[PDB]
Specification:
The structure is a monomer. The strands form 3 sheets. The chain has a 5-stranded antiparallel β-sheet, covered by helices on one side. The chain has a 3-stranded antiparallel β-sheet with strand order 8-9-10. It is 37% helix and 15% strand. It has 10 helices and 10 strands. Helix 6 runs antiparallel to helix 8 and helix 8 runs antiparallel to helix 9. The longest helix is centred in the middle third of the chain and has 20 residues. The chain binds 3-(3-methyl-1H-pyrazol-5-yl)pyridine. 3-(3-methyl-1H-pyrazol-5-yl)pyridine binds next to strand 7 and strand 8. Homodimer; homodimerizes following heparin- and ligand-binding. Interacts with CBL, IRS1, PIK3R1 and PLCG1. Interacts with FRS2 and SHC1. Interacts with PTN and MDK. It comes from Homo sapiens (Human). It is found in: Cell membrane. Belongs to the protein kinase superfamily. Tyr protein kinase family. Insulin receptor subfamily.
C-alpha cells in the first residue's frame, strides 16, 4: 500500500504487461526494450535478491506510477508476475545528466541557455513534487535524465530509490547533497530538496564536476556545518550563483520554495549578460 496525492494504491493498480510482449535490446549501464512497438527502458530486479529488495522494487513502481508530470519519467507498466521482475519506464535517449554534462563539455555545442533550461526542467518537477508533498531526498545530476542529447532536450527526474528506501548506511548517504538538519538530525522536508537542488545547480554549471571537489564526506560535513559553502563554478554568472547560495541557507525557513526558484531561474534566462556568458573549454 502506497499513498500519494490524496489516494492509496497497491500492486494491483499497476499495469501488468504480459512478459511475452517484452523484448530486451541492450544494456544501458537497465535495458532498452520493446513492447508490442513501443520503445522503453526496462529496470530489472535481480532474481538473486532478498525479500527487502522485493518490497523495495514494488514500492518504486507504485511511487513512479502515481506521478503525472512532464519532468518526471513516466512508468509504462510492470511485468511482476514473471522472473526477473520488470518495471517499464520512459526511454530517455540522452542518458543521465551527469554523464551528458561531462561528455558534452565544450572542447576544441553547449551554451548557458541550455544549462538554464535543464535547471528549469528539474525545478519544475521538484515544484510538482513539493506541491504534492513528496520529498525526493536525492536530487542530484546522477538521478536526472535527458530525452535526447541534441537541441530540444527535456530533463526529467528519473530515479526514486532514496524516497523508496526511507519509505542504507553512513558511507552511502549522499552527504554532499544534504543540508545540516538532514545529516545531523535526520529531518527531511521540502526544504531538504531545496538544498539539494542548489547542489545540483552547481553540478550543472560546473559541467558535471563532483561537489566539494577535493573534500571527503566527513570534511564536507564539518565544512558545511561551520557555514562553509562551495565557490561559484568557473564562469558562473552571479545571478545563478545567487540562486545556489539561497538554496544553501543554514535555516530551512530561509531557503526558497521551488515556486521562487523557478521564478529566479526564469529571470536568469531573460538576462542577456547571463545567457551570453561563455562556457569554459
Ligand atoms: C529509466 C530510464 C533510464 C534511461 C537511460 C539511461 C541511460 C542511457 N539511456 C537511457 N532511460 N530511461
Amino acid at each position: 500500500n502506497y499513498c500519494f496525492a490524496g489516494k492509496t494504491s497497491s500492486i494491483s493498480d499497476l499495469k501488468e504487461v504480459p512478459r511475452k510482449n517484452i523484448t530486451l535490446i541492450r544494456g544501458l549501464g537497465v535495458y532498452e526494450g520493446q513492447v508490442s512497438p513501443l520503445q522503453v527502458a526496462v529496470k530489472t530486479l535481480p532474481e538473486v535478491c532478498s525479500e527487502q529488495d522485493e518490497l523495495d522494487f514494488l514500492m518504486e513502481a507504485l511511487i513512479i506510477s502515481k506521478f503525472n508530470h512532464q519532468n518526471i519519467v513516466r512508468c509504462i507498466g510492470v511485468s511482476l508476475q514473471s522472473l526477473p521482475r520488470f518495471i517499464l519506464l520512459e526511454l530517455m535517449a540522452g542518458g543521465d545528466l551527469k554523464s551528458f554534462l561531462r561528455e558534452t563539455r565544450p572542447r576544441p555545442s553547449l551554451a548557458m541557455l541550455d544549462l538554464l533550461h535543464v535547471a528549469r526542467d528539474i525545478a519544475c518537477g521538484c515544484q510538482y513534487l513539493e506541491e504534492n508533498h513528496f520529498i525526493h531526498r536525492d536530487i542530484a545530476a546522477r538521478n536526472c535524465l535527458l530525452t535526447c542529447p541534441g537541441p530540444g532536450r527535456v530533463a526529467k527526474i528519473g530515479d526514486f530509490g532514496m524516497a523508496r528506501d526511507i519509505y542504507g548506511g553512513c558511507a552511502m548517504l549522499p552527504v554532499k547533497w544534504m543540508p545540516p538538519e538532514a545529516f545531523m538530525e535526520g529531518i527531511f522536508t521540502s526544504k531538504t530538496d531545496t538544498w539539494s537542488f542548489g547542489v545540483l545547480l552547481w553540478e550543472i554549471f560546473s559541467l558535471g564536476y563532483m561537489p566539494y571537489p577535493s573534500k571527503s564526506n566527513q570534511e564536507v560535513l564539518e565544512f558545511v556545518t561551520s557555514g562553509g559553502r562551495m565557490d561559484p563554478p568557473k564562469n558562473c554568472p552571479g545571478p545563478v550563483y545567487r540562486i545556489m547560495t539561497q538554496c544553501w541557507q543554514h535555516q530551512p525557513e530561509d531557503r526558497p520554495n521551488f515556486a521562487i526558484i523557478l521564478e529566479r531561474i526564469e529571470y536568469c534566462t531573460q538576462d542577456p549578460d547571463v545567457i551570453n556568458t561563455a562556457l569554459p573549454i
